[PDB]
Amino acid sequence: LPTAQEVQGLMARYIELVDVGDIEAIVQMYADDATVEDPFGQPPIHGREQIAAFYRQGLGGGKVRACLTGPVRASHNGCGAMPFRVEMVWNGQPCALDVIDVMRFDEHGRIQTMQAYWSEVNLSVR
Amino acid sequence: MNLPTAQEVQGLMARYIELVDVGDIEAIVQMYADDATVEDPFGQPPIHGREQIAAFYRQGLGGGKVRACLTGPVRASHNGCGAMPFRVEMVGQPCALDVIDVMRFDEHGRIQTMQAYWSEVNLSVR
Ligand SMILES: C[C@]12CCC(=O)C=C1CC[C@@H]1[C@@H]2CC[C@]2(C)C(=O)CC[C@@H]12
Numbered sequence: 001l002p003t004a005q006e007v008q009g010l011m012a013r014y015i016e017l018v019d020v021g022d023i024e025a026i027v028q029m030y031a032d033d034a035t036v037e038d039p040f041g042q043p044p045i046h047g048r049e050q051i052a053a054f055y056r057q058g059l060g061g062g063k064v065r066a067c068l069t070g071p072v073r074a075s076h077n078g079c080g081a082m083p084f085r086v087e088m089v090w091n092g093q094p095c096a097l098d099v100i101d102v103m104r105f106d107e108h109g110r111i112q113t114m115q116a117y118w119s120e121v122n123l124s125v126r
Numbered sequence: 127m128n129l130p131t132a133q134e135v136q137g138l139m140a141r142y143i144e145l146v147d148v149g150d151i152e153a154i155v156q157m158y159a160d161d162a163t164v165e166d167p168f169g170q171p172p173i174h175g176r177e178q179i180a181a182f183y184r185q186g187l188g189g190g191k192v193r194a195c196l197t198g199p200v201r202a203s204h205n206g207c208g209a210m211p212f213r214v215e216m217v218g219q220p221c222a223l224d225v226i227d228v229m230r231f232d233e234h235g236r237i238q239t240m241q242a243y244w245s246e247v248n249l250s251v252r
């Protein structure tokens with residue numbers, strides 16, 4: 001699996017791709033049989049096309065920005081967790097959302113599972 | 127309480143950090159379900175049950191000179207789970223360790239599972 005150092009780099013790359021809104025590059029980071037649970041607690045999404053649709057729905061508008069708010073924490077079994085903040089516009093109101101993603105990678109360095117922790121308690125109107 | 131709401135998760139997880147910071151081992155153990163599991167660091171084999179969990183905390187915190195503080199908000203779901211970023215300070219050099227814990231709570235408000243994400247890449251010495 002990817003080493004702890006490689007996990008930190010992969011997860012930081014993911015945030016860069018969200019920040020610039022490169023949906024095709026994000027989708028290509030996922031394994032073909034990956035699952036996304038975002039927000040955690042909702043049913044998982046499976047399949048490349050469904051994941052692409054999810055990111056298009058979320059990042060389509062183009063006014064989404066994202067940045068890490070602390071270091072990526074990485075294990076020795078190909079997993080990591082990271083804290084970040086998303087900025088977006090919601091019916092005129094600029095907003096921010098604090099999120100933690102947990103990811104498990106496969107032997108090819110592709111995301112096998114993603115779980116995103118957030119709810120309305122993590123939402124701020126600016 | 128019952129299965130904790132998102133707001134209750136934020137309060138429970140913040141209280142956990144307080145208890146780590148002060149080093150109240152018995153109060154920590156009583157936040158866990160009787161048959162809880164801990165994976166710390168994630169990737170190592172789980173421990174099972176309050177007696178094993180107490181031994182773990184006694185070893186890690188019993189020497190004193192461990193402090194802990196949240197470095198950002200607790201992220202909480204609507205299914206009794208949350209994730210939080212924090213930093214542990216300890217001491218031959220003074221170091222810091224950046225960690226994310228993920229917790230799932232039971233229907234009584236006790237921690238059923240805890241997974242801690244960190245490795246040597248998250249340790250800073252001076
Ligand atoms: C998909 C996403 C970014 C990438 C990531 O890894 C985690 C999240 C979760 C919150 C999403 C966000 C994108 C923007 C969304 C859709 C909103 O406008 C409300 C919820 C929020």
Ligand SMILES: C[C@]12CCC(=O)C=C1CC[C@@H]1[C@@H]2CC[C@]2(C)C(=O)CC[C@@H]12
Pocket residue numbers: 146166186187192214216223225227242244
């Ligand atoms: C148990 C613990 C605190 C509570 C928590 O929630 C997560 C951790 C994981 C890292 C532990 C730390 C306690 C202090 C430890 C034992 C060290 O001196 C090196 C590793 C570190």
Ligand SMILES: [Cl-]
Pocket residue numbers: 069070071083197198211212224
């Ligand atoms: Cl942090």
Ligand SMILES: [Cl-]
Pocket residue numbers: 069070083084098197198199211
């Ligand atoms: Cl944060």
Ligand SMILES: [Mg+2]
Pocket residue numbers: 159232
């Ligand atoms: Mg029980």
